[PDB]
């Protein structure tokens, strides 16, 4: 698991003034690596398909209530013509 590197180590001392050819070192933490713990990404069990099932069941349940309300409100036009026509005839009797 060691990355390949031909060269071991080299040395020409670090005078703060004489910095030339500005490269950048690999910045590392001071803590032992063992707690830089492992990669884990876990799925939500509710799947893109499962939410489809749940929301479709909800849509189909709501459609029944919408149809119930429509059929409750679809009888009012029958009520108007069932209630007012006899009243119009009674007025006509005069």
């Amino acid at each position: 698991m060691d990355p390949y590197c031909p060269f071991d180590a080299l040395d020409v001392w670090e005078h703060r003034r004489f910095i030339v050819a500005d490269s950048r070192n690999f910045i590392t933490p001071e803590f032992p690596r063992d707690f830089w713990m492992s990669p884990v990404f876990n799925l939500p069990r509710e799947t893109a398909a499962e939410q489809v099932v749940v929301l479709q069941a909800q849509r189909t349940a709501a459609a029944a209530a919408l149809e119930n309300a429509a059929m409750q409100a679809a009888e009012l036009p029958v009520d108007i013509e069932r209630r007012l026509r006899p009243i119009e005839r009674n007025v006509h009797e005069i």
Binding site: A69, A70, P77, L84, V91
Partner: protein, 47 residues
């Protein structure tokens, strides 16, 4: 002559207009609830 023949005119005008006032309620209250039904169907059409 003019007494009884003009007295009945008030009731004539009342009845011949009460005949139309109910017709207006018949028409005006049917073109309004149909909007409610259309809105309900539109809401279902959103689903």
């Amino acid at each position: 002559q003019r007494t009884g023949r003009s007295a009945l005119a008030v009731l004539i005008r009342a009845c011949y207009r009460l005949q139309q006032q109910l017709q207006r309620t018949r028409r005006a209250l049917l073109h309004h609830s149909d909007a409610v039904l259309t809105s309900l169907h539109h809401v279902r059409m959103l689903l």
